[PDB]
Structure formats: C-alpha cells, structure tokens
Design an enzyme around this catalytic site. Structure first.
Site, PDB file in Angstrom:
ATOM      1  CE  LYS A  63       7.883 121.361  52.590  1.00 16.31           C
ATOM      2  NZ  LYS A  63       7.375 122.707  52.980  1.00 16.31           N
ATOM      3  CB  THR A  92      20.822 109.827  62.874  1.00 18.95           C
ATOM      4  OG1 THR A  92      20.192 109.832  61.588  1.00 18.95           O
ATOM      5  CG2 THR A  92      21.418 111.184  63.149  1.00 18.95           C
ATOM      6  CB  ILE A  97      25.051 108.004  66.056  1.00 19.36           C
ATOM      7  CG1 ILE A  97      26.309 107.160  66.312  1.00 19.36           C
ATOM      8  CG2 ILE A  97      25.380 109.334  65.350  1.00 19.36           C
ATOM      9  CD1 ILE A  97      27.066 106.869  64.992  1.00 19.36           C
ATOM     10  CB  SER A 171       5.051  96.721  66.622  1.00 17.48           C
ATOM     11  OG  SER A 171       6.268  95.985  66.754  1.00 17.48           O
ATOM     12  N   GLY A 180      10.100  95.895  64.698  1.00 17.11           N
ATOM     13  CA  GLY A 180      11.465  96.395  64.646  1.00 17.11           C
ATOM     14  C   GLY A 180      12.355  95.842  65.744  1.00 17.11           C
ATOM     15  CG  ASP A 183       9.344  97.206  72.606  1.00 21.00           C
ATOM     16  OD1 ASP A 183      10.396  97.811  72.897  1.00 21.00           O
ATOM     17  OD2 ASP A 183       8.828  97.260  71.473  1.00 21.00           O
TER      18      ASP A 183
HETATM   19  N1  LIG Z   1       8.872 108.144  71.659  1.00 17.10           N
HETATM   20  C1  LIG Z   1       8.380 106.958  72.143  1.00 17.10           C
HETATM   21  C2  LIG Z   1       8.888 105.707  71.714  1.00 17.10           C
HETATM   22  C3  LIG Z   1       8.319 104.580  72.223  1.00 17.10           C
HETATM   23  N2  LIG Z   1       7.305 104.663  73.125  1.00 17.10           N
HETATM   24  C4  LIG Z   1       6.607 103.510  73.698  1.00 17.10           C
HETATM   25  C5  LIG Z   1       5.482 103.072  72.756  1.00 17.10           C
HETATM   26  C6  LIG Z   1       6.205 102.040  71.871  1.00 17.10           C
HETATM   27  O1  LIG Z   1       5.286 101.162  71.236  1.00 17.10           O
HETATM   28  C7  LIG Z   1       7.020 101.307  72.958  1.00 17.10           C
HETATM   29  C8  LIG Z   1       8.199 100.604  72.288  1.00 17.10           C
HETATM   30  O2  LIG Z   1       8.735 101.524  71.332  1.00 17.10           O
HETATM   31  P1  LIG Z   1       9.589 101.054  70.122  1.00 17.10           P
HETATM   32  O3  LIG Z   1      10.748 101.909  69.856  1.00 17.10           O
HETATM   33  O4  LIG Z   1      10.057  99.556  70.310  1.00 17.10           O
HETATM   34  C9  LIG Z   1       8.569 101.187  68.704  1.00 17.10           C
HETATM   35  P2  LIG Z   1       7.224  99.998  68.487  1.00 17.10           P
HETATM   36  O5  LIG Z   1       5.897 100.635  68.652  1.00 17.10           O
HETATM   37  O6  LIG Z   1       7.391  98.789  69.468  1.00 17.10           O
HETATM   38  O7  LIG Z   1       7.394  99.462  67.002  1.00 17.10           O
HETATM   39  P3  LIG Z   1       8.655  98.686  66.381  1.00 17.10           P
HETATM   40  O8  LIG Z   1       9.454  99.582  65.502  1.00 17.10           O
HETATM   41  O9  LIG Z   1       8.089  97.420  65.580  1.00 17.10           O
HETATM   42  O10 LIG Z   1       9.535  98.180  67.618  1.00 17.10           O
HETATM   43  O11 LIG Z   1       7.509 102.407  73.809  1.00 17.10           O
HETATM   44  C10 LIG Z   1       6.848 105.914  73.519  1.00 17.10           C
HETATM   45  O12 LIG Z   1       5.936 105.964  74.321  1.00 17.10           O
HETATM   46  N3  LIG Z   1       7.389 107.005  73.015  1.00 17.10           N
HETATM   47 MG   LIG Z   2       9.301  97.857  69.607  1.00 22.21          MG
HETATM   48 NA    NA Z   3      20.803 106.847  66.126  1.00 22.70          NA
END
Ligand SMILES: Nc1ccn([C@H]2C[C@H](O)[C@@H](COP(=O)(O)CP(=O)(O)OP(=O)(O)O)O2)c(=O)n1
Ligand SMILES: [Mg+2]
Ligand code: NA
Ligand code: NA
Ligand code: NA
Length: 326
Positions: A63, A92, A97, A171, A180, A183
């Site tokens: 790809k 989604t 959703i 982040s 985004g 946290d």
């Molecule tokens: N599948 C996942 C999802 C999240 N986490 C942990 C690590 C992540 O940084 C924190 C907040 O996620 P988030 O969904 O807030 C993503 P984040 O890293 O904070 O970036 P942003 O988009 O700027 O908010 O939760 C994990 O361990 N496994």
């Molecule tokens: Mg986050």
């Molecule tokens: Na969704």
DNA sequence: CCGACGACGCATCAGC
DNA sequence: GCTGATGCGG
DNA sequence: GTCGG
C-alpha cells in the site's frame, strides 16, 4: 509530518477496519504501523524501506508503494464512494456510537446528522450528549485554554478538601500544544489500595464542579471514573467557549505512579509498554506492576515510588511524558 | 504456520 | 436483584 | 495485518 500522507492513509485504513469491518486487530495493526512511521526521522521513499520498521509487513508495504507512485490508494478511493461504509464511519464520530450502533443505525436508514436529530429517541443518554455537542467535541483545545481549565479544576478541588491532589494527564501532560479533551487524575489520602475511609470521594468533586457550572453534562459516572462535559466561563458580550470532554479518574493514593503512567499515555505508548512488560515477565495496569509466574499468573504488586521505577522493572530507559506521544 | 495482540470502568442487556 | 457478556470509552 | 518462535 515528513510522512503525513502515509500516516494519514494508514489512519483511514485503521478507522475503516474498526468502524466498518469490526476487525479490531487490523485497526491496531494499522495504528501501530502509522505510529512507527510517524516517528521515523526520514522521508520514506519506498515500501521496502518502510517494511524494515516493526509493524509494517508486506501488505502495508504494498500500500505504501501504491501511495508513493500515485498519491492515493484505490482501496480507500472505493471505500470513500461506498455510501454505507461512509455513513457507518461518520456516525461513529458521535461519542457513544461505536461500530455496532453505527451499522445498526445505517441499516435503519439513519445515516446523516439530520437523521440522528430526528431520531433522538433511539439514542441512549451518552449518544444523546455526543450528538448535542457533536460540533464542539470535534474542535481541539488550545493549550492556553487547557491552562485555564486546569486552574479551575485544581482550585475547585482544593475548596472541597485540601488533601485532594488533581493532576492533568493525557496529551496535556505530554506537552501538547492542543488537546482533544481534558484528563484529570485525582487522589485523596482516604482512598488507598488498603481501604476507602470516606464515601463519595469522586462525587463530591464532580458535584462541586457542577455547582460552579464548569461541568455541564455527564456521560457516565461511577465510584472511580467520571466522563462528561465542561465549559470555560466567558466574559460579558463574549462568544461562549465550546463545550469540552472531561474525564476524571480517582486512583488509590498509593498507586499514583502506575495511575499517572497510564493516564499520561499515549494509548499506543501504553500498549507498546505493556506488551514489552509481558515479554519481560510483568503485567502493568493503572494500579500495579506485578510479576508473572511460570504458569503465567500475576503475582503480588511490586514496590513503586516513581514512574521511572516502572521503566526500570521492564528494563526501559526512562522517557519523559513529552517523548511518549506515539 | 499460529497464537498472540494492554488493561480496564461504566452502561446496557440477557438470562436467571 | 444478581452475574456474565458485550459495546463503548479512556 | 504483523510478528517471534
Ligand atoms: N485505548 C486507550 C485510550 C486512552 N488511554 C489512556 C492514555 C491516554 O493518554 C489517556 C487519555 O486518553 P484520551 O482519549 O484522552 C487521548 P490523549 O492521549 O489524552 O490525547 P487527546 O486526544 O489530546 O485527548 O488514557 C489508554 O491507555 N488506552
Ligand atoms: Mg485526552
Ligand atoms: Na463514537
Ligand atoms: Na517490518
Ligand atoms: Na478523544
């Protein structure tokens, strides 16, 4: 963004496999490939160069050759024209959703934003809030606003009880110039792995933040995890700030470093790190790092006094939060 | 070839 | 009511 | 979809 075209392609393939195909392991394979390519410090010039990296196999290599030659991927070009796939993928994007609900709705003929609004009664509570704030939850949060939100959360938690400690993770803690969402890790000395000496520890914080009209809506709420909506206050005559997603995780105070390691992420960093821990004979969650016996069963929690101790156990050099953005 | 792929909280549902 | 499985999310 | 063994 030396290879932004390639990583964007892999990201759209990952989302397709998750949302349409419901192939969660293809989604993680594509995401991991995109991650390894994103930190590769050269402009990729062929798929064979890319295949040298771990997580890029023959299929992704092919790809990448197609994309480098033409600038596009026929597979994606088709996926974009298929009205069902595109509709499932779009739905989604609403919080709450996922791939099952999205295919369920597209089957029922609900496949646009307008179609969701007219059928609001077919949504559970989370989905209803996700639809309400759909446009806002699409917007990024500048770090300057993250700093104001931090100030509010930390000061309102101090007013409830001076012994709480609130730490912004995600982040933001990795130093992102925009996030985004927000946290928040929360600890209180009355909640340890040993005992819970006060009830409502998270609820009181959530309730204080609602009272000052910071928290505006709730997606889900239990004894240790809150997921909801917040908004900065605006000035006289000023346009309102967008509503934002906020997550709050109450973690036993003696398990803070495992908790802040987890909540600082990224999600792909945590998956790589926990997979590495397994190969080293440990398992890591947000509470503990434990050794694995010969049978594979987790043993007792190992003593941890810093994030770096967790790296040391699995024989990783320490990585500061800012270098964990995979 | 083949199993393994990180780990878990909360909402919702089926079956009792 | 409960437990267990599933969807969705961090 | 990819990988180590
Ligand atoms: N599948 C996942 C999802 C999240 N986490 C942990 C690590 C992540 O940084 C924190 C907040 O996620 P988030 O969904 O807030 C993503 P984040 O890293 O904070 O970036 P942003 O988009 O700027 O908010 O939760 C994990 O361990 N496994
Ligand atoms: Mg986050
Ligand atoms: Na969704
Ligand atoms: Na490779
Ligand atoms: Na997000």
């Amino acid at each position: 963004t030396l290879n932004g075209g390639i990583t964007d392609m892999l990201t759209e393939l990952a989302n397709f496999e998750k949302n349409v195909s419901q192939a969660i392991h293809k989604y993680n394979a594509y995401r991991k490939a995109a991650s390894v390519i994103a930190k590769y410090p050269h402009k990729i010039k062929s798929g064979a160069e890319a295949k040298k990296l771990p997580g890029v196999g023959t299929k992704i290599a092919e790809k990448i050759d197609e994309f480098l030659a033409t600038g596009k991927l026929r597979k994606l070009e088709k996926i974009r024209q298929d009205d069902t796939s595109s509709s499932i993928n779009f739905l989604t994007r609403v919080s709450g959703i996922g791939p099952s609900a999205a295919r369920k709705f597209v089957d029922e003929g609900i496949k646009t934003l307008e179609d969701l609004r007219k059928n609001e009664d077919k949504l559970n509570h989370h989905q209803r809030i996700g639809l309400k704030y759909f446009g806002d939850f699409e917007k990024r949060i500048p770090r300057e606003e993250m700093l104001q939100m931090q100030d509010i959360v930390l000061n309102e938690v101090k007013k409830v009880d001076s012994e709480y400690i609130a730490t912004v993770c995600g982040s933001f803690r990795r130093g992102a110039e925009s996030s985004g969402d927000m946290d928040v890790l929360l600890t209180h000395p009355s909640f340890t792995s040993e005992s819970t000496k006060q009830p409502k520890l998270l609820h009181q914080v959530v309730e204080q933040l609602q009272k000052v009209h910071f928290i505006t809506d709730t997606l889900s709420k239990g004894e240790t995890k809150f997921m909801g909506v917040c908004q900065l206050p605006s000035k006289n005559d000023e346009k309102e700030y967008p509503h934002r997603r906020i997550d709050i995780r109450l973690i036993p105070k003696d398990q803070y470093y495992c908790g802040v390691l987890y909540f600082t992420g990224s999600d792909i960093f945590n998956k790589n790190m926990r997979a590495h821990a397994l190969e080293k004979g440990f398992t890591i969650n947000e509470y503990t790092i434990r050794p694995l016996g010969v049978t594979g069963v987790a043993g007792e929690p190992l003593p941890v006094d810093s994030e770096k101790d967790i790296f040391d156990y699995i024989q990783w050099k320490y990585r500061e939060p800012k270098d964990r953005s995979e």
